[PDB]
Amino acid sequence: LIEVQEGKAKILIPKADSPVFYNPRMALNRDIVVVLLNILNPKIVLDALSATGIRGIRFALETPAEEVWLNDISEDAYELMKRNVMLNFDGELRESKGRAILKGEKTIVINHDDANRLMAERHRYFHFIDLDPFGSPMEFLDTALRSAKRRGILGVTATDGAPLCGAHPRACLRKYLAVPLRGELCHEVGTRILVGVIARYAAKYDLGIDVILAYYKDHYFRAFVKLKDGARKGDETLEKLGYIYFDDKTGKFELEQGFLPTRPNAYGPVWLGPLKDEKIVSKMVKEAESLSLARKKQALKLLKMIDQELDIPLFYDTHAIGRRLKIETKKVEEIISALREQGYEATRTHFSPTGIKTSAPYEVFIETIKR
Numbered sequence: 001l002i003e004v005q006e007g008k009a010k011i012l013i014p015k016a017d018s019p020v021f022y023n024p025r026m027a028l029n030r031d032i033v034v035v036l037l038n039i040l041n042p043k044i045v046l047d048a049l050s051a052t053g054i055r056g057i058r059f060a061l062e063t064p065a066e067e068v069w070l071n072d073i074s075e076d077a078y079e080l081m082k083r084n085v086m087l088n089f090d091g092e093l094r095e096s097k098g099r100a101i102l103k104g105e106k107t108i109v110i111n112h113d114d115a116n117r118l119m120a121e122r123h124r125y126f127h128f129i130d131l132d133p134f135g136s137p138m139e140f141l142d143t144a145l146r147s148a149k150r151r152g153i154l155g156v157t158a159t160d161g162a163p164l165c166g167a168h169p170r171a172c173l174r175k176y177l178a179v180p181l182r183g184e185l186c187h188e189v190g191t192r193i194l195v196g197v198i199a200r201y202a203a204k205y206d207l208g209i210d211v212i213l214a215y216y217k218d219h220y221f222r223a224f225v226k227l228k229d230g231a232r233k234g235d236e237t238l239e240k241l242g243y244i245y246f247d248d249k250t251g252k253f254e255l256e257q258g259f260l261p262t263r264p265n266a267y268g269p270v271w272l273g274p275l276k277d278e279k280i281v282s283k284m285v286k287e288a289e290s291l292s293l294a295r296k297k298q299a300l301k302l303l304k305m306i307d308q309e310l311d312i313p314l315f316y317d318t319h320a321i322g323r324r325l326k327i328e329t330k331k332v333e334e335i336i337s338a339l340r341e342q343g344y345e346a347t348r349t350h351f352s353p354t355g356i357k358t359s360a361p362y363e364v365f366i367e368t369i370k371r
């Protein structure tokens with residue numbers, strides 16, 4: 001074991017294929033959720049697959065959370081979780097049958113079990129649940145949707161982007177029950193597929209969702225949603241689902257709002273609603289600035305990008321469209337300036353370095369990008 005620091009937390013990680021997983025590259029992901037929790041202030045929270053326990057520990061040390069649950073099915077992880085918790089908190093970690101509880105300023109509950117089992121035991125109990133598995137979160141989604149309060153918050157990560165970006169079509173259908181789209185738009189389509197599957201699974205509980213923040217980064221998808229209580233709210237949520245049509249020869253996309261598509265070659269279903277709560281994300285940029293984060297600079301760069309990013313379905317990739325149409329194109333910075341000069345909204349997007357979010361119709365965009 002070796003000592004490592006992330007944010008205000010000091011933890012021990014196995015030195016090495018490792019007995020307990022820890023990825024420092026995910027410190028940024030952790031920072032983001034920490035920043036968000038400092039805005040929404042959920043009291044009772046769950047770190048469902050904590051591994052070393054770093055997430056829940058940071059929740060306890062850096063957010064207003066009052067009761068923090070850390071869980072993992074692995075005995076090795078559980079043992080390390082207890083050790084790392086006592087490395088950051090004083091008091092008596094009372095253990096009994098695979099569960100250790102510390103009742104200090106903040107109450108910490110370390111659990112050893114299947115996340116589905118723990119969440120089933122804690123029905124309508126958490127104000128916030130963070131699902132951060134190895135790959136897909138689908139094995140845990142339905143139960144989390146029952147474990148969180150009817151107005152709770154859900155944080156979901158999908159690490160395997162192969163099915164979501166269209167590389168593995170078969171798997172995407174099986175796991176997300178949606179038809180993926182490969183290419184320059186896959187980072188967003190995959191993100192919208194994730195939000196859409198959450199909305200779809202939630203509906204049967206007479207719950208709807210409002211997206212707080214959903215983004216893509218370094219080959220992983222993240223989505224934070226606020227559960228809405230009510231059948232009608234569930235109805236209205238499903239009405240925000242839709243499909244995407246994409247022309248491989250031009251890069252032009254079409255949107256179709258509706259539970260089912262009505263034309264061939266449709267992609268989805270996907271969430272066609274907003275991918276961010278403008279006000280909350282605005283506050284997040286400010287909060288990240290007044291907080292001691294693990295990767296403050298990277299956190300702010302991503303948050304600022306998303307904050308200024310136009311929230312509209314999809315975008316146009318200058319490089320990709322140039323290739324599909326077989327034409328020379330202008331630089332992104334120039335194209336944005338030109339679009340704005342013509343009276344159209346246009347911004348860069350975190351989904352792709354060469355992508356441009358704009359209100360401009362496809363044909364106006366093409367005429368603008370042409371060398």
Ligand SMILES: Nc1ncnc2c1ncn2C1O[C@@H](CSCCC(N)C(=O)O)[C@@H](O)C1O
Pocket residue numbers: 020021022023026030048049050051052053054055071072073074077113114115116132133134
């Ligand atoms: N059914 C299950 N219930 C609870 N944990 C599970 C599980 N199946 C797999 N896991 C596990 O999930 C892992 C995902 S790695 C997770 C990391 C993280 N949440 C962070 O920020 O560090 C392992 O620690 C592990 O044993």
